[PDB]
């Protein structure tokens, strides 16, 4: 059916079956996530956890495919699913990987200020940022 859960499930299955990964299978994977986004209206799904994972997966895959273009996809996921800490952290991780440390901190702090959940995740990420690690989570 047409809901984030069945979509997310079929997407993860596609990833598991796309190993080992080539540019061609990566492209196919990304196109499939875009088809999910075309079918799932954001305003119904702003607090749906599967929908949020779909948006973050699409951004992360685009981050691999073409980093200098992916930012707008991370912003889209944050605008659509602002309640979830993992969304903001994902954005902060991408900015960090680009050397954009000040922007990475602002994302984490804005999320704390806006009450994104769970708070523990934001605190760990911010701890790691200040310990100057490469990964906000592990
Ligand atoms: Pb609508």
Structural domains in the chain, CATH included, are 1-138 (1.25.40.10)
Does residue 84 sit in helix, strand or coil? strand
Ligand 1 centroid distance, CA of 48 (Å): 14
38 CA to centre of ligand 1 in angstroms = 12
Phi first, then psi, for residue 81 (nearest 5°) are -135, 50
Angstrom resolution of this structure: 2.6
Q: What are the phi and psi torsion angles at 5 (to 5°)?
A: -65, -50
CA of residue 99 to ligand 1 center, whole Å: 37
List the one residue out of 74, 83, 64 whose CA is nearest residue 104.
74
Name, in order, each residue with C-beta under 8 angstroms of 90's C-beta and a sequence gap of 6 or more. 56, 59, 60, 74, 77
Backbone angles phi, psi at 84, to 5 degrees: -90, 115
Q: Is the peptide bond before 118 cis (omega within 30 degrees of 0)?
A: yes
Cα 63 to averaged position of ligand 1 atoms, centre (Å): 27
- Cα 4 to ligand 1 centroid, rounded to whole Å: 14
d(CA 105, CA 97): 12
Q: How many angstroms is it from 44 CA to the middle of ligand 1?
A: 6
- Per the CB < 8 A criterion, the answer to whether 58 and 35 are in contact is no
Residue that the structure tokens 């690690």 belong to:
133
Ligand 1 center–CA 6 separation, angstroms: 19
d(CA 45, ligand 1 centre) in Å: 9
* Technique behind the model: X-ray
Expressed in angstroms and rounded, the spacing between residue 3 Cα and the centre of ligand 1 is 13
CA–centroid distance, 42 to ligand 1, in Å, is 7
- Distances 63 to 11, 44, 58, 76 between C-alpha atoms, Å: 17, 26, 9, 14
Tokens standing for 101?
């440390």
């Amino acid at each position: 059916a047409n809901n984030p859960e069945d979509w997310l499930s079929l997407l993860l299955k596609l990833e598991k079956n796309s190993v080992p990964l080539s540019d061609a299978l990566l492209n196919k994977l990304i196109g499939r996530y875009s088809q999910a986004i075309e079918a799932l209206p954001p305003d119904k799904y702003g607090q749906n956890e599967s929908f949020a994972r779909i948006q973050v997966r699409f951004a992360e895959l685009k981050a691999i495919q073409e980093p200098d273009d992916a930012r707008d996809y991370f912003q889209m996921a944050r605008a659509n699913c602002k309640k979830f800490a993992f969304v903001h952290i994902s954005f902060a991780q991408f900015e960090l990987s680009q050397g954009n440390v000040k922007k990475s901190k602002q994302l984490l702090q804005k999320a704390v200020e806006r009450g994104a959940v769970p708070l523990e995740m934001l605190e760990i990420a911010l701890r790691n940022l200040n310990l100057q690690k490469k990964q906000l989570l592990s």
